[PDB]
């Protein structure tokens, strides 16, 4: 029942292959559903539910909004060049903003900006003031809090518009969002110098949260385990592994344990 809508903007002075001058990706509960860049200059879908939105010339309009705003990203890129006394070259401007619905129905909002891969300025919409990270950021704090309008305008969107679209988005993608897909689990064995390296792999689970652990005759082995980060598949599902180094006679005491929302009780797997 909690949900998220976030937009990620990347803007750079010098394009490069696969890096346009400006790109924007919208995510629903972490899965892409809307894309735009300054080469195609067109808002395009990234999820199937977006295809039955019911707004008619919504795509034409939001495309135009984006086309118009990449002017302002180019300006802010030069402002930031001169404010930080850099040369002309490669610089990078980044933005993440959006809203959350928590399980009690309350709302959160965020608007964060990043220059050169470092924090720059963040909205604290509770106080309608910006937290600056910098001498250079302190200016934009003072210019934004002088004019008076942006903080509350962005607080408005975050608390109203954003949330209004979130709920509509959740009900179009109800079926994708609530589907569940079990993991296929396989345990692999490889010993070299009298050390058996057991590798447990969980493929294709949705949703993303997972527990994977290792059991030695039924007792967790939390320090002898290293696990990878949950990483994405191409079809919206996820992937994780967990290895353990153990000794080849201690082989039939070893179980991988996979707790996932898709299974009522944890699965157990051996090699």
């Amino acid at each position: 029942e909690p949900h998220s809508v976030r937009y990620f903007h990347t803007a750079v002075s010098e394009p490069s292959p696969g890096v346009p001058q400006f790109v924007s990706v919208g995510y629903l509960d972490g899965e892409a559903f809307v894309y735009y860049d300054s080469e195609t200059r067109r808002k395009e879908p990234r999820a199937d539910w977006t295809s039955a939105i019911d707004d008619q010339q919504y795509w034409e309009r939001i495309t135009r909004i984006s086309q118009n705003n990449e002017q302002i990203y180019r300006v802010n890129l030069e402002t930031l060049r001169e404010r930080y006394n850099q040369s002309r070259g490669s610089h990078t401007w980044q933005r993440m903003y959006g809203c959350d619905l928590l399980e009690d129905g309350s709302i959160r909002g965020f608007d964060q900006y990043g220059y050169e891969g470092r924090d720059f300025i963040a909205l604290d919409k509770d106080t309608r003031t910006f937290t600056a990270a910098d001498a250079g950021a302190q200016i934009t704090k003072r210019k934004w809090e002088e004019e008076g309008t942006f903080a509350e305008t962005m607080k408005f969107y975050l608390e109203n518009t954003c949330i209004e679209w979130l709920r509509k988005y959740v009900s179009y993608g109800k079926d994708v969002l609530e589907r569940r897909e079990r993991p296929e689990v396989r345990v692999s064995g490889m010993e070299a110098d009298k050390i058996l390296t057991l590798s447990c792999r969980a493929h294709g689970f949705y949703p993303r949260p997972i527990s994977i652990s290792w059991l030695k005759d039924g007792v967790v082995q939390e320090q002898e385990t290293q696990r990878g980060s949950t990483v994405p598949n191409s079809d919206g599902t996820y992937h994780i592994w967990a290895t353990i180094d153990v000794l080849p006679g201690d082989r039939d005491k070893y179980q991988c344990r996979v707790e996932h929302a898709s299974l009522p009780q944890p699965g157990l797997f051996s090699w």
Binding site: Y7, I65, S66, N69, N76
Partner: peptide, 9 residues
Amino acid sequence: AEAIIVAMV
């Protein structure tokens, strides 16, 4: 939908 008002730095 994206927020229309973008600010300048």
